[PDB]
Amino acid sequence: MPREIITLQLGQCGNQIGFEFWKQLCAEHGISPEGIVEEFATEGTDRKDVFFYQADDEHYIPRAVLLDLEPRVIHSILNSPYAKLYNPENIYLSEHGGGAGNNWASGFSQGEKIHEDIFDIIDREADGSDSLEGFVLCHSIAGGTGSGLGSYLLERLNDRYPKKLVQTYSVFPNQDEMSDVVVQPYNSLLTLKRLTQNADCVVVLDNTALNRIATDRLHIQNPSFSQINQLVSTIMSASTTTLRYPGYMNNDLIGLIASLIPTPRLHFLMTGYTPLTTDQSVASVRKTTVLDVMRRLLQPKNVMVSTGRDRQTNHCYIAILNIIQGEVDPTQVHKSLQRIRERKLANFIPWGPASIQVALSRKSPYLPSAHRVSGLMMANHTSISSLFERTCRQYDKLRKREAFLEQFRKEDMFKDNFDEMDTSREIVQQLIDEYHAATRPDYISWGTQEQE
Amino acid sequence: EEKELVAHLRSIKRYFLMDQGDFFVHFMDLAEEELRKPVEDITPPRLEALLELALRMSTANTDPFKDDLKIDLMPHDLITQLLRVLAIETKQEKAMAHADPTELALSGLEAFSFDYIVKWPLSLIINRKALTR
Amino acid sequence: RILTHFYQGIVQQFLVLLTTSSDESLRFLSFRLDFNEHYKAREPRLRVSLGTR
Amino acid sequence: MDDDIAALVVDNGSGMCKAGFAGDDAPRAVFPSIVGRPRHQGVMVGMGQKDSYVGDEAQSKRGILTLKYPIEHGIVTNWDDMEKIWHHTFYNELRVAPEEHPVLLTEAPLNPKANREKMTQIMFETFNTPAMYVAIQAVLSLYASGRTTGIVMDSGDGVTHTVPIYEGYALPHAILRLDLAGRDLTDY
Amino acid sequence: LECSWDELWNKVQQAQDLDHIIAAHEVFLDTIISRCLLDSDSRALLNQLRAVFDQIIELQN
C-alpha cells in the first residue's frame, strides 16, 4: 500500500501553498474540483493513496489538512473550487480565527490551546489514510500562524506520533527586504527552534527568493502570495510525480532521502528544479540531453533554495540527487555522470564516497506535459547553513534591538525570555560548523560532541 | 546516398580538418587542462568523456555527422604523427612507418586524432590508408 | 572503521573487476562513486589503478 | 491456376465500409466506417499500440483508442483518415497491394465532384493503383438487379438516398438524399 | 536493467521472425546476467559482491 502523506498548510502563506498543492495533485491525478476522478483519468497506475484518500468509489479526496490559527486562510481554501475535493473531516480551522499576530510564541500558545482539537483533526485525516507515513507542513516562518501554530502542531505531532517522520515546507521571511514585522525574525527564530527540536526536516522557502524569481523570471514586480503558492503547487506536483508515476525505484520518500540525510542535524534541505522556463515557453518540448540537464541544473538561477554566501565556511556539495522527469535514456544518464565526473561538475563529500544520483521519472499520463524532459535536483550543500546563519543574524538584529519583542513576550512561549531565538542562533551556528566539517575529511567525526 | 560520401567528407572537414573553428576552439578550451597531462598521466576514458562533452557543448553539436566522429588515441605524439605524415609523400614513409611511437608521454593535445567508423562496402572509400592520412 | 576497511578492500577488488568489467557504464559509476576521490583516498588500489592505466 | 488479378470492390455504406474482390459474392472485409486513434498516446505506446486503428482494428482497440468516423452521415468527412482506413483494410484484412489490383470504389449519391477528385488523387498517388473506378453505391446495387431503369433505395446507418436511374443513367433531377438512416433509428 | 531492456525492446520492435525474437531475448538475458555480475567470468566478482552484501547486512545489524 502507498505511504500516505498528510499535508499541513499553516498560516496565510502556508495555507495558500497547501491549497494550491492539493489543487495541483488533483489536476495531476485527474481529480475534479469536487474530488471526483475525471473520466479521462483512466490510467489507474498512479498512487493516490500517498497523497489522496478515496471519498467514494469515484471521488478521491486529498489527504490534506489545512491548519491556521486565523480562520481567514482555512475559509479561503474552503472558498476555492476545490473545497469539495478535500475531506471536510481533514479541515481544521481555529475557532478563534485571530491568528498569532505574526508572533511565533502566540502561534505556539494557540496550538497548545487547540492541541486536542488539532490532534483530533489530524486523526480524522489520518483515518482517511490507509498507510499514513507522516505529515508535511506548509507554512511561513515569518508570520504567526504558519510559524507559531506550525511549531505547536509539530510539537504535538511529535508527542503523539513520536515514531513518524515530520517534514516541513517552512516559508522563511525575505532576507533582502527589510520586514515591516520587526518581530518577524523573532517569530522565525522561535519557529526554527521548534523545527530544530521537534521537526525532522524543514524545507526553507525564502520569500526573498520567491520574489526574486517572480521578478526576474515571471516579470512580477511584486510577487503575490498567490503566485508563490502556485509555484509551491508546481513544486509539490513535481515532488509527488514519483508517487503519481510509479516505477522501479524511489517509490517512497524515505527510500529517496535516506542517502541524502546522514545525520539528524543536517536536516536543512536545498531544492532544485529543471529545466527552468517561463510560462510562455511551454510550447516547445526541448529534447534536453542529460548533459544539458546537468549543465542547466548547476546554474544558481535554477536552484529552488536561496543559500547565503557564506564567506567563512568552505561550503561544498555532500551529495546530489537529480530527479529527472520525462524521456531519459539510461546510457545518456551514464555518459552524463561520466562527463560530470571528468569535468568535476559535482563536488562530493570528502569523508566518504559520494556521487550525483540521477533519477528518471515518468510524467503523469492524465496531465499533458508541455515539456519532454523535467527535473528535480536534491542536493546536500553546506551553503544551506549560510541561510540559517542569516536567519540567526536577523533574529539577533531584532533581538539586539528588542524590536517588536513585546508582542512575543505577550505570548507564553516568549513571555519570560527570548530563549527560542538564542536556541535558533545556536542551532544555526552548529549547522554551519557541521556543514563546514562535512566539506572536510574530518566529517567522519562531524556531529560528535567532541567535535561540536 | 547509402554511404553518405558528402556527409563523411563534411564530418572529416569539421573534425579532421578543423573546419568548425568555433567548435574546435571551444573543445580545445574545455579539454586543454586534461589534455595537457602526460600520456602516462592521461586517463583515456576521461579524455573521451571530455571530448564528447566539448562536442556537445561546442558548435560541433550542430554537426549532423558528429555521431560518426569517434575519438582515436594516436600511439605517438603530434610531432611524431606529423613527421610520419611528412614522410608519407617522401621515401621516408617506410622509415616513419617503422618509427616506434614516440616514447614521450604525449599530451592529449599531441595525442588527439579523429577516427571515423566506415562500414563495408562504404569502407572501400574511407580506406585505412586514407583514414590514417 | 572496521566496516569502512572491509568496504575499502571490497571496493579495491571491485575496481579491479570494473577495469576488467566489460560494461563501460559500470566504470563510469565507479568514477562517480569517488567524485571527491574519498574512496580513492582511502583505498590505495583505487588510487593506483586510475593512475597507471 | 491463372492468378487473374482481381479488381478491388469497396462498398462504402453509410454505417459500415465493406470491401472485397471483384467476382466475390460478398465483400471480404466489412467494418464500420470508423477510424480509431489511441485515446492515450502515452501509456500504450510502449505496448505496441498503433497510433490509429481502422475498421475492425479500431473496434478491437476501442478501449484505448478514440474512434473517429472519416465518413459522416454517409459523407466522407476526413479524406486523410478515410485513406488511412482504406490502406489499413488493404494491407491487413485483404493483405493485397493496391498498386497491383484495379480498385472499384463506391460513392454516396450526390457525392461532391471535388470530394470524388480528392479521393481519386489519394487513390492514384498514395496507392499507385493500376486502375480504378468510382461508382455510386445505388447504381451498383441497380446493376446487381439486372436493370438499367429504376430507383435504388440504398439505406445504410448514416444516410438514405433515393436514386432514380433510367436506361443505365441516373436521373440527377430525381435523385433524393435523406439524412435519416440506421443511426437515427438506433438513437430512437 | 534499463540498457538490457532497451536493447531487448529495440530488437523485438525490429524483430522480423520468431528466431530473431528468441535471439534478442537470449542476448538480453545474457547481457543482464553479465551486467548483473551473474556470468561465469564475474563469478569471483559475484562472490565479492555477495560478501559486500553480507558485510552490509552485518553493519546494519
Q: Residue D11 is part of a domain; what is its CATH number?
A: 3.30.420.40
Q: Do D40 and A43 touch (CB under 8 A)?
A: yes
Residue A92 contacts residue A121 (beta carbons within 8 Å)? yes
What is the number of residues in chain D? 188
Contact flag A335-B49 (C-beta cutoff 8 Å): yes
Alpha-carbon span A147 to A195, nearest angstrom: 10
- The residue of chain A with its CA nearest to that of B54 is A339
Round to whole Å and give the CA distance between A62 and A19: 10
Pairwise CB contact (< 8 Å): C51 & B41: yes
Q: In 3-state terms, what secondary structure has residue A62? A: strand
The domain containing residue D17 runs over which residues? 6-137
**Please, which chains are in contact with A (at least 3 CB pairs closer than 8 A)?**
B, C, D, E
- Minimal Cβ distance to E34: which of C3, C6, C22: C22
Is A224 among the annotated ligand-binding positions?
A: no
Rg (CA), chain A: 21
DSSP A286-346: ----HHHHHHHHTSGGGBS------SSS---EEEEEEEEEE---HHHHHHHHHHHHHTT-S
Asked if residue A202 lies in contact with residue A139, where contact means CB atoms within 8 angstroms, the answer is no
Grid cell in block for residue C14: 571491485
Give Cα A153 to chain centroid, integer Å: 16
Candidates D88, A382, A342; CA nearest to B42 is: A342
Distances (CA, A) of D74 to B93, D30, D69, D90: 80, 15, 10, 21
Write down the residue that cell numbers 517552512 correspond to.
A170
Q: Do at least 3 CB pairs under 8 Å connect A with D?
A: yes
Cβ D85 vs Cβ D54: under 8 Å: yes
Report chain B residues whose CB lies below 8 A from the CB of C28: 45, 49
Q: Closest chain C residue to B39 measured between Cα atoms?
A: C53
- Ligand-binding site membership of A101 (annotated): no
C28 to chain B nearest CA, in Å?
Answer: 9
Residues D110-142: b if buried by 16+ CB within 10 A, e if exposed: ebeeebeebbeebbeeebebeebebbbbbbbbb
The answer to whether the CB of A191 falls within 8 A of the CB of A155 is no
- Going by the DSSP 8-state scheme, the letter that residue A148 receives in this structure is I
Q: What is the SS3 string spanning chain C?
A: CHHHHHHHHHHHHHHHHHHHCCCHHHHHHHHHHECCCHHHHHCHHHHHHHHHC
E3 neighbourhood in chain A, CB within 8 Å: 330-331
Q: Which helix (H) or strand (E) holds A21?
A: helix A11-29
In angstroms, what is the C-alpha Rg of chain E? 16
Q: CA C25 → CA A218, A338, B9, D122, E52, distances in Å? A: 39, 8, 31, 50, 20
Spatial contact of A47 and A243, defined as CB atoms under 8 Å apart: yes
CA A432/CA A382 separation, integer angstroms:
7
Q: Name residues 1-30 of chain E within 8 A of C (Cβ).
A: 3
CB atoms within 10 A of CB A57: 6
Provide the 3-class DSSP secondary structure of residue A68.
strand
Place of cell 551556528: A429
A379: contact with C, CB 8 A cutoff:
no
Q: Which long-range contacts (CB under 8 A, 24 or more apart) does E4-12 make?
A: E4/E28, E4/E31, E4/E32, E4/E35, E6/A329, E6/A330, E6/A331, E7/E31
- Angle at alpha carbon of residue D76, lines to D75 and D80, rounded to 5°: 175
A352 is an annotated ligand-binding site residue: no
C-alpha cell at A21: 498543492
Report the alpha-carbon distance of residue A361 to residue B45 in Å, rounded.
29
Classified as helix, coil or strand, A114 is coil
Q: Which three cell numbers stand for residue E51?
A: 560478501
Contact in structure between A380 and A277 (CB atoms under 8 Å): no
- Selection from A383, A387, A365 nearest residue A44 by Cα: A365
Give the 3-state secondary structure of chain B: CCCCHHHHHHHHHHHCCCCCHHHHHHHHHHHHHHHCCCCCCCCHHHHHHHHHHHHHHCHHHHCCCHHHEEEEECCCCHHHHHHHHHHHCCCCHHHHHCCCCCCCCCCHHHHEEEEECCCCCHHHCCCHHHHHC
Q: Phi/psi at D101 (nearest 5 deg)?
A: -130, 135
Contacts of A315 (CB under 8 A, 6+ apart): A307, A381, A382, A383, A385, A386, A435, A436, A439
What is the SS3 assignment for chain D? CCCCCCCEEEEECCCEEEEEECCCCCCCEEEECCEEEECCHHHHHCCCCCCCEECHHHHHCCCCEEEECCEECCEECCHHHHHHHHHHHHHHHHCCCHHHCCEEEEECCCCCHHHHHHHHHHHHHHCCCCCEEEEEHHHHHHHHCCCCCEEEEEECCCCEEEEEEECCEECHHHCEEECCCHHHHHHC
**Degrees to nearest 5, angle at CA A88 with A85 and A93:** 120
Instruction: Check residue A404 and report its DSSP letter.
Output: T
B56 contacts in A (CB within 8 Å)?
Answer: 289, 291-292
Phi-psi region of E58 (alpha: psi -120 to 50; beta: other; left: phi over 0): alpha
Tell if the CB–CB gap between C34 and A353 is shorter than 8 Å.
Answer: yes
| A128 belongs to an annotated ligand binding site | no
Rounded CA separation D142/D125 (Å): 30
C-alpha cell recorded at residue A144:
504567526
In Å, how far is C9's CA from the nearest CA of chain A? 14
Are the C-beta atoms of residues D150 and D165 closer than 8 Å to each other?
A: yes
Distance CA E61, CA E44 (A): 26
With touching defined as 3 or more inter-chain CB pairs under 8 Å, the answer for chains E and C is yes
> How many Å apart are CA B67 and CA B60, to the nearest integer?
10
Neighbours of A369 (CB within 10 A): 17
Nearest chain E residue to C19 by CA distance is E45
B44 contact residues in C (CB cutoff 8 A) = 53
**In 3D, which of B30, B53, B55 has the Cα closest to residue B108?**
B30
Breaks in chain E (C to N over 2.5 Å), named by the residue before each, are none
Give the DSSP letter of residue A416.
S
Q: Which three cell numbers stand for residue E53?
A: 552484501
Contact A12, A140 (CB under 8 A): yes
What is the 8-class DSSP label of residue A35? Answer: S
Task: Kindly list the residues from chain C whose CB atom is less than 8 angstroms away from the CB atom of residue B43.
Answer: 50, 53
CB–CB contacts below 8 A, A to C: 53
Interface test with C, best of A259, A331, A333, A334 (most C CBs within 10 A): A334
Interface check for B41 against chain C (CB to CB < 8 A): the answer is yes
Task: State which amino acid sits at residue D59.
Answer: Q
Q: State the pairing for strand pair D160-166/D169-170.
A: antiparallel
**Do the annotations mark residue A35 as ligand-binding?**
no
Peptide bond into A275 cis (omega under 30): yes
Query: Would the CB atoms of A45 and D43 count as touching at under 8 Å?
Result: yes
Chain E CB within 8 Å of residue C1 CB: no
Q: Is C41 on the interface with A (CB under 8 A)?
A: yes
Which residues of chain E neighbour A248 with C-beta distances below 8 Å?
1
Largest CA distance in chain A: 61
Bridge partner list, A93: A68
Structural contact between residues A29 and A148, judged by C-beta atoms closer than 8 angstroms: no
Sign of CA dihedral A342, A345, A350, A356: negative
Q: Give the type of residue at D136.
A: I
Measure the CA angle with vertex A432, ends A427 and A438; round to 5°: 120
Q: Tell me which residue of A153, A147, A120, A186 sits closest to A414, measured CA to CA.
A: A186
**Residue carrying C-alpha cell 504558519:** A146
CA distance B83 to B102: 11
Measured between beta carbons, the chain C residues lying within 8 angstroms of A347 are 35-36
Angle at B130 between CA B126 and CA B131, to 5 degrees: 70
| Interface contact E35-C17, CB threshold 8 A | no
- B29 contact partners, CB below 8 Å, separation of at least 6: none
| CB–CB contact A354 C29 (8 Å) | no
Task: Please indicate if the annotation marks A391 as binding a ligand.
Answer: no
Judging contact as 3 or more Cβ pairs under 8 Å, the answer for B and C is: yes
- CA distances to A205, B75, C13, C48 from C19, rounded to whole Å, are 45, 21, 10, 12
Residue A169's SS3 state is strand
User: Does A370 appear as a known binding residue?
Assistant: no
The enclosing H or E element of A133 equals strand A132-140
C-alpha cell at A275: 529545466
CA–CA distance, A150 with A143 (Å, rounded to integer): 10
**Rounded distance between C-alpha atoms, residue B131 and residue A290, angstroms:** 32
Contact A81, A31 (CB under 8 A): no
For CA atoms A258, A262, A263, A267, the dihedral sign is negative
Q: Which three cell numbers stand for residue D183?
A: 443511426
DSSP A81: G
CB contact under 8 A, C33 and A342: no
Nearest to C35 among A348, A351, A441 (CB): A348
Question: At CB < 8 A and 24+ separation, what contacts does A51-56 make?
Answer: A51/A4, A51/A5, A51/A7, A51/A25, A51/A240, A51/A243, A51/A244, A52/A25, A52/A26, A53/A4, A53/A87, A53/A90, A53/A128, A53/A129, A53/A130, A55/A87
Spatial separation of the C-alpha atoms in residues E33 and E1, rounded to whole Å: 10
Q: What is the DSSP string of E14-29?
A: H--SHHHHHHHHHHHH
Using the CB atoms, write b or e for A423-437: b if 16+ within 10 Å.
bbbebbebbbbbbbb
Name every residue whose Cβ is closer than 8 Å to that of residue A233 and which is 6 or more positions away in sequence: A17, A20, A21, A23, A24
> What is the distance between the alpha carbons of residues C41 and A251, in angstroms, rounded to a whole number?
34
- Contact of C7 with chain B, judged by CB distance below 8 Å, is answered with no
Q: Does C27 touch chain B (CB under 8 A)?
A: yes
Chain D residues whose C-beta sits inside 8 Å of any chain A C-beta:
39-40, 42-43
The single residue listed with the C-alpha cell 489543487 is A23
| Method by which the coordinates were obtained | cryo-EM
The string of DSSP letters for A213-237 reads: HHHHTS--SS--HHHHHHHHHHHHH
Q: Using CA atoms, how far apart are residues B38 and B33, in angstroms rounded to an integer?
A: 11
* Contacting subunits of C (3+ beta carbon pairs below 8 A): A, B, E
Give A36's DSSP letter: B
- Residue A141's closest CA among A301, A11, A34? A11
C 18-37 residues inside an 8 A Cβ radius of A:
24-25, 28-29, 31-36
